Amino acid sequence: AISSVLNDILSRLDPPEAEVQIDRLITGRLQSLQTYVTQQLIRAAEIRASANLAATKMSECVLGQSKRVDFCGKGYHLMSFPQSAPHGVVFLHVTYV
Amino acid sequence: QCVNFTTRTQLPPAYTNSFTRGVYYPDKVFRSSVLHSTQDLFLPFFSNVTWFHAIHKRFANPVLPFNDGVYFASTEKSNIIRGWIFGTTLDSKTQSLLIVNNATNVVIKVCEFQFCNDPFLGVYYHKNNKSWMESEFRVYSSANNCTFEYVSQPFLMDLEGKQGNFKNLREFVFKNIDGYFKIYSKHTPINLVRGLPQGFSALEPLVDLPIGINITRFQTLHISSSGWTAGAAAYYVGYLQPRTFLLKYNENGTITDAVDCALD
């Protein structure tokens, strides 16, 4: 389009001519908005995959004792201490080596 | 006027390096603790500019072409340089831009002048009431058809004569954007003998000259008529190029660092 501000388009081109340039802004900004939403939905699958993995480690490593290898961390697991962290969680694992 | 100075001669085109020179505020936007990247006509870092000087038995005032923009480097003591003369043919055939420095404001006169081969301005009678004021006009014999006139903002300058190495430094940038002439000025004291020192400074906006004249070449106005001599000063001429810089803006709205990404 001519400019990103709609006031610059309405102050120059005629109302019939301005609708063409505004549609270029709408189609582009919508595609830009659809791209953002698409990326957020794709990243939503990774944050939920990590949350289900964190909830699994929270259950097995913290609450109980997991015999799974390289799950609660290297070595024979003993106890896990969860710690709050921004936009996530930090696990402190006690291992036997 | 038409006769040059007895000490006027052509110096060899030596070159010197400009460490950070060519950095200036691109606009009036204030920014704090952010890194902004802009692209305009700039002087690349670690470049080579012509090495010129003028004294009272060597005087050099060559005419240099103006294409992509010019960078001004003025090392002064008593502030000899009063400005620069701009124009296409630098005569009455077309418009000509001049810069008059009275150590108060910057006078820009765009008119049709009759060009003298060695432009000069008479400064005489220092016995009483020196004042270091300009009086006589040896630059142009006649003046007419003025399409533009401007007066800048006042500033401070010390015209007292000094001895030893260089002291004052005035770095200017002249460019043509869509006919609008944007001149950017910076003035700081330095300790320099020859060449250029390694340092960093930003050029503040000086004047806006929406004139629109075409300028294919420029000459320098050094002034302080074969009997008239010049003072002790050195001057360098740079060339602007379309380079992209990364500017570091501090909390006070100044440039604390600059990076040329087209160099290394």
Binding site: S11, R12 | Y25, D27, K28, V29, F30, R31, S32, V34, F148, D178, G179, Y180, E204, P205, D208, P210, G212, N252, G253, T254
Partner: protein, 362 residues
Amino acid sequence: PLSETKCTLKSFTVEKGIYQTSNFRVQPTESIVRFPNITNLCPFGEVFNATRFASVYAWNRKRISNCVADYSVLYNSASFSTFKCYGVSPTKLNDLCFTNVYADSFVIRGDEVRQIAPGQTGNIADYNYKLPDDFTGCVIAWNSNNLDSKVGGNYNYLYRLFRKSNLKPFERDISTEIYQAGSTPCNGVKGFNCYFPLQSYGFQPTYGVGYQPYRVVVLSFELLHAPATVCGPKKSTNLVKNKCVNFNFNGLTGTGVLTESNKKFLPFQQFGRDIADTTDAVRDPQTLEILDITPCSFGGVSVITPGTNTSNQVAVLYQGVNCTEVNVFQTRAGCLIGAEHVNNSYECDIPIGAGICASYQT
């Protein structure tokens, strides 16, 4: 507000829970424009009293800055032959802020009147002189066909029809000599399918509009960062901070909340921007003041109501906005209207935010 949820969910039964309907936004109640006193006035009517106007490339201009075009003498109302205007009128230029104003005077033909547009092409634009992109004004013309036009053409005024390249905004070429006409340089003297660049008017009083001389006055404008000192004959309107208003500061028109800022601007810097390259803070052109530019507060409207078969009680929630209009309580999520604040802690039923939950109880 319960029925607003019904039209949102497209059903006549609203289940218990929090539902978003509309988006609350504060409209500006005032227009604040603050600029210093009047210095000079632009020559809007001073160029209309001239005897005659020069040619297209010879146009006369007088530079009077400080925006604020002379509104006392206005000849722009039905005083001339025809008026083709763009943007805002000279009467409306009082509400805009300009740096430098050039009053231009030139004579063209009828076909070249429609060719005048801000920063556009044309026979007089890319060849003689091109107007800058900043022109918001009116193109004023008068009919000279009964005065300047002569029988058999008027050769007094001149114009350059051809040039080797198109001009940029605010660029001029006054050379009348023989130069390149088309895309192929003919190397000086006319020939080799080139033409003589300079041309003369063919004005005939007996032909149509296209051959009629029209004296045109164009006011060149500057939208750049240099501040304007005056807006309108009525300027202030009294700035009151902490309110949603429509502001024009230093030539930047916007709508938002005005707050005082402690930022120190460089004397050569008019206004700041944020990391998003949007207006952040501006400086007062009248006195020394730093105004932080913030947009007017807005947020979503959430309707908190139980099931349709339970009760019709509705709790309106404003997200991240303070309610200045207005059981009006304020939480970290925002203004909550229609609910009561209980200091006791209960199991969360309808979640709100920041650890606040709503429920329907006695």
